[PDB]
């Protein structure tokens, strides 16, 4: 139980063996969503992040951007196309809920000034870097 | 308790605001002295019961930690922890920087290799990070 609003079960499919910071590939339990995640070398060993390892991905809401710009999405390490299902606008931040293709709901916290063109029903892309995710067992 | 976050600290919530979408909490760490500021969604603040007295674990991933020697940068950040670098591991793209904290703790930061060339073991530095870079776990 953590504050991260996006907690996705998945499985390690690959892991590199760089000495300071390593990357792993994760397939989500929906069986289609692939993610790239970076972790320190000590952590990859300590957690035993080898092919087939089941894990829980923790992606805090503010680490997720929501964009209508395909280049922004393509520049990021991870891209999850979807459809905005709900928008709650606060004074300083916005909660953007996005329906993923499988029906799950992604949550992003976006600065109010970056959500002015966003509206429910729009096709957008959720994006984040590999080093913005925590792996939990 | 088993997560990749290299920094995992016990703390007690000592304050919480009730802003609509994103709220902030003050967290007093295990040393009974260090206070952090953390941002969470309103839904999470209620779901987790992040009220005064609530004990939690702070998860801070290595790449979220900046290292500086500049007073302004440290003061401008939401959280800053002074320490001394105890070890550096240089890599082709990233460097692991470990910093000794009071009461035998070690903070771990992952810094891009081209930004850590002036960092060296034994320097007095300040680690810093945003309120919205921390995850709170029950
Ligand atoms: O820790 Mo949150 O509620 O994903 O911002
Ligand atoms: O090893 Mo990490 O980068 O603290 O998740």
From Swiss-Prot, chain B:
Domain of life of the native organism: Bacteria
Annotated Mop domain residues: 2-69, 74-138
Entry keyword set: Activator, Cytoplasm, DNA-binding, Molybdenum, Repeat, Repressor, Transcription, Transcription regulation, Transport
Region listing for Required for dimer formation and molybdate binding, in residue ranges: 3-11
GO MF entries: DNA binding; molybdenum ion binding
Subcellular location(s) per record: Cytoplasm
Primary role: The ModE-Mo complex acts as a repressor of the modABC operon, involved in the transport of molybdate. Upon binding molybdate, the conformation of the protein changes, promoting dimerization of ModE-Mo. The protein dimer is then competent to bind a DNA region, upstream of the modABC operon. Also acts as an enhancer of the expression of genes coding for molybdoenzymes, both directly and indirectly.
Protein name: Transcriptional regulator ModE
Species of the source: Escherichia coli O157:H7
Gene: modE
Residues of the full protein shown: 123 to 260 of 262
